[PDB]
């Protein structure tokens, strides 16, 4: 419902601060953290620009513990699970949840309540020692998930004592460790209302002296109900129900109403493992961004509430059509790598969309559009930000709730108010033609000829090595056009964009700092086996600094010969899966800025 829009973004005019408030994902159960598939996934998840994903919300961490007869527990599985997060620069959004060796049966029994308190205290004590208390203090702790679905039994009172025990457990070591909840699934459920009453008036069953503290309020609100049918996400209703909850707090518990509000599981549709094919396509990138933009425009900007964090729950392991950030190819079903079944994973739009969004800056700029933008009616939305050091990062979102709608509009994008001097314009796109590995896969001929030679089919369930190389080129956030460098003496740039429905476009306009970018650091190389037992190496590294619009190449030397490039697309994330390394392989990673300059140093190892 629009043909051409002229959009002017004025980088010289700051409107308000901008936070990237969506930098989280999650999955269940905690045991996946011990599997090699998840280990590989965490390299991609921890490699987004500027901590583009920072928190993992993993269910049933305490099922990793078991009672060692006595006071304590065998911590060794939990240690491995937390260590993999920390090692990939991820932090737990730590749900105090699970039941070590089934020991907990009754939260009204005050000896159990006290034992739970002691478990929480022991957790904080151990991990504060293992990683440092500075690390611990960057975490968030949460109540056990739902509790308004299959909360074993325990009741409202059990729940409220459980909360008390969590809070007293953290307070024994450090009261500044943030605690919140209830992480309820249904809007204004009994559990939710009860915890709010308890934390407002109400008194802790372990102290006896006022309500237990609450540092944030968390709920799950999702776009549409679980179904085998492709029901249509209602994205604006997520914000409507969140504001309803806030209204409930303003009326009934005004002392809590200004607290940080968290949607700890914000997905377009309930039921991750149902098959909804749009999870593999640009629709999902569009819709994640659309949900984000609605929260920014309707909650944060007018200050209707202190909305602080939105976590997706899309790091489950599964196929193209499930709510997963990778498509898993291999023999395992989740609904030493020489022991376990080999596998390949391909990035999907749930992750690439977050790669693009991770590039956003820290300040909202003024934007004017003609005709004026009306995202709730026609689907064209914008997140226009200024980067530290100058320049802009703009997300242009063309997304509607309906899955089955296509089309395109024209945008003339103008950016003014830049500091004069050269700038580079980088255009990244997720749509049907770009960053589109599922489309590529569907068009690949299945060489196993499962319907015989006269009926070729696509979508090979076991792609060839060459097919996988084609998918891995397509899986990376793609340049819509080659980067252009503009000598903008007037501090203006402009560009024409063809904007499909659905699509996500990231426009980066970055100044020339005058020197090559900083070299990458901390290169880790690990062995995996791909489908058919093919040798593979996963590379993970860190950016040399916080510069915008940095792209990485991966090179290979054998066994001393000069380095040749082995990455296909320029990488914006600090992770790369390499297939079939030669003998005596040495890896090197180079950073490239948008002006074509290579980091003077490459980072080596193997």
Ligand X SMILES: Cc1cc(=O)oc2cc(O[C@@H]3O[C@@H](C(=O)O)[C@@H](O)[C@H](O)[C@H]3O)ccc12
DSSP state string for 454-520? TS-----SS--HHHHHHHHHHTSPEESS--EEEEETTS-EEEEEEEESSEEEEEEEEE--SSPPPPP
The minimum distance between CB 222 and ligand X, in angstroms, equals 7
- Identify which of residues 94 and 595 has a Cβ nearer to ligand X in the complex: 94
- What is the spatial distance between Cα 34 and Cα 181, in angstroms, rounded to a whole number? 27
> Are the C-beta atoms of 26 and 142 separated by less than 8 Å?
no
Cβ closest to ligand X, residue 186 vs residue 234: 186
Contact 482, 563 (CB under 8 A): no
Nearer to ligand X, 301 or 419 (CB): 301
User: In angstroms, what is the minimal distance from the CB of 211 to ligand X?
Assistant: 18
Contact 180, 216 (CB under 8 A): yes
Question: Could you tell me the smallest distance in angstroms from the CB atom of residue 386 to ligand X?
Answer: 16
Q: Which is nearer to ligand X, 226 or 561 (CB)?
A: 226
Q: Write down the least CB distance from residue 466 to ligand X, Å.
A: 35
Q: Least CB distance from residue 114 to ligand X, whole Å?
A: 26
222 vs 347, beta carbon nearer ligand X: 222
- State the nearest-atom distance from the C-beta of 361 to ligand X, in Å: 13
Distance separating alpha carbons of residues 230 and 281, to the nearest angstrom: 14
Strands 326-330 and 343-347: antiparallel
Under 8 Å CB-to-CB from 319, ≥6 apart: which residues?
275, 327, 328
6 burial type by CB count under 10 A (0-12 exposed, 13-18 middle, 19+ buried): middle
Between 19 and 606, name the residue whose CB sits nearer to ligand X: 19
Residue nearer to ligand X on the CB measure, 272 or 468: 272
Q: Which is nearer to ligand X, 205 or 261 (CB)?
A: 261
Nearer to ligand X, 57 or 423 (CB): 57
Rounded Cα distance, 592 and 570, in Å: 9
Distance in angstroms (rounded) separating the CA atoms of residues 411 and 428: 15
Q: How far is the CB of 185 from ligand X (least distance, A)?
A: 3
Please state, in angstroms and rounded to a whole number, the distance separating the CA atoms of residues 27 and 315: 5
Q: Between residues 97 and 382, which has the closer beta carbon with respect to ligand X?
A: 97
d(CA 162, CA 107): 6
Question: Which residue in 137, 587, 478, 536 sits closest to 342, CA to CA?
Answer: 536
Angle made by CA atoms 597, 601, 606, in degrees to the nearest 5:
120
Peptide bond before 376: cis, by omega within 30 degrees of 0? no
Nearer to ligand X (CB atom), residue 27 or residue 73:
27
For ligand X, give the closer residue by CB, 170 or 185: 185
Rounded to the nearest whole angstrom, what is the least distance from the CB of residue 559 to ligand X in the complex? 43
Q: How far is the CB of 492 from ligand X (least distance, A)?
A: 31
CB of 260 to ligand X, least distance (A): 3
In 3-state terms, what secondary structure has residue 559? coil
For the bound state, the minimum distance from the C-beta of residue 300 to ligand X, rounded and expressed in Å, comes to 12
CA 603 vs CA 204, 525, 544, 553, 558: distances in Å = 54, 12, 10, 11, 16
Q: Which is nearer to ligand X, 92 or 437 (CB)?
A: 92
587: Cα separation from own chain's centroid: 28
**Interface residues with ligand X (CB under 6 A)?**
19, 28, 54-55, 59, 93, 140, 145, 149, 178, 185-186, 216, 220, 260, 262, 265, 267, 270-272, 308-309, 313
Tokens of 581: 């390394």
CA–CA gap between residue 335 and residue 574 (Å, rounded): 29
Residue 276 three-state SS: coil
Residue 370's CB is within 10 A of a number of other CB atoms, namely 11
Q: ∠ at Cα 19 (349, 436), nearest 5°?
A: 10
CB 360, min distance to ligand X, A: 12
**Shortest reach from residue 443's CB to ligand X, in Å:** 30
Q: What's the rounded Cα separation, in Å, for the pair 287 and 64?
A: 34
Between CA 412 and CA 410 the distance in angstroms is 7
């Amino acid at each position: 419902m629009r043909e051409r829009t002229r959009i002017n973004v004025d980088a010289s005019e700051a409107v308000r601060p901008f936070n990237r408030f969506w930098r989280g994902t999650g999955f269940s159960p905690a045991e996946l953290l011990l599997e090699p598939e998840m280990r590989q996934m965490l390299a991609y998840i921890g490699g987004l620009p500027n901590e583009g994903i920072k928190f993992l919300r993993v269910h049933y961490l305490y099922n990793l513990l078991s009672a060692k007869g006595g006071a304590g527990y065998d911590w060794s599985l939990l240690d491995r699970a937390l260590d993999v997060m920390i090692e990939h620069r991820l932090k737990p959004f730590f749900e105090l949840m699970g039941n070590p060796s089934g020991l907990f049966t009754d939260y009204e029994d005050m000896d159990q309540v006290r034992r739970w308190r002691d478990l929480v205290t022991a957790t904080v004590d151990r991990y504060g020692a293992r990683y440092g208390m500075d690390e611990l203090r960057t975490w968030y702790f949460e109540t056990t998930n739902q509790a308004d679905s299959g909360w074993w039994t325990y009741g409202i009172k059990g729940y409220t004592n459980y909360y008390d025990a969590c809070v007293a457990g953290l307070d024994a070591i450090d009261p500044s460790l943030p605690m919140g909840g209830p992480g309820t699934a249904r809007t204004l459920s009994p559990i939710f209302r009860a915890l709010m009453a308890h934390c407002d008036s109400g008194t802790s069953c372990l102290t006896g002296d006022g309500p237990p503290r609450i540092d944030y309020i968390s709920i799950h609100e999702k776009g549409v109900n679980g179904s085998k049918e492709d029901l249509t996400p209602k994205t604006n209703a997520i914000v409507d129900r969140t504001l309803l909850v806030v209204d409930y707090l303003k009326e009934h518990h005004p002392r809590l109403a200004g607290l940080p509000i968290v949607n700890d599981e914000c997905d377009p549709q309930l039921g991750w493992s149902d098959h909804h094919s749009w999870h593999g396509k640009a629709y999902y990138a569009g819709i994640i961004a659309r949900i984000i933009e609605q929260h920014d425009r309707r909650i944060i900007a007018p200050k209707a509430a202190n909305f602080t964090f939105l976590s997706s729950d899309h790091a489950f392991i599964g196929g193209w059509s499930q709510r997963t950030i990778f498509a898993y190819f291999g023999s395992r079903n989740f609904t030493d790598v020489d022991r376990t079944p080999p596998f390949d994973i391909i990035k999907k739009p749930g992750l690439t969309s977050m790669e693009l969004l991770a590039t956003l800056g820290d300040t909202v700029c003024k934007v004017t559009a003609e005709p004026p933008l009306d995202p709730d009616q026609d689907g064209l939305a914008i997140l226009p930000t200024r980067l530290p050091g100058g320049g802009v990062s703009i997300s242009l979102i063309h997304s509607v709730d309906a899955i089955n709608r296509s089309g395109r509009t024209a945008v003339r994008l103008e950016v003014s108010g830049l500091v004069p001097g050269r700038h580079a314009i980088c255009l990244l796109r997720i749509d049907e033609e770009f960053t589109n590995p599922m489309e590529v896969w569907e068009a690949q001929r299945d060489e196993s000829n499962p319907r015989g030679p006269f009926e070729p089919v696509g979508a090979p369930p076991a792609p060839t090595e060459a097919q996988f190389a084609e998918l891995r080129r397509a899986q990376e956030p793609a340049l819509l056009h080659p980067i252009s460098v503009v000598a903008c003496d007037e501090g203006r740039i402009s560009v024409d964009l063809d904007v499909p429905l659905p699509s996500l476009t990231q426009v980066l306009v970055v100044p020339d700092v005058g020197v090559p970018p900083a070299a990458p650091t901390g290169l880790v190389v690990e062995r995996y086996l791909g489908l058919g037992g093919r040798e593979e190496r996963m590379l993970f590294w860190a950016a040399g600094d916080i510069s915008p619009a940095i792209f990485y190449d991966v090179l290979v030397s054998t066994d001393g010969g000069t380095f040749e490039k082995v990455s296909s697309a320029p990488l914006i994330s600090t992770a790369f899966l390499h297939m079939s390394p030669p003998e005596g392989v040495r890896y090197a990673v180079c950073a490239r800025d948008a002006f074509g300059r290579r980091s003077e140093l490459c980072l080596s190892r193997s």
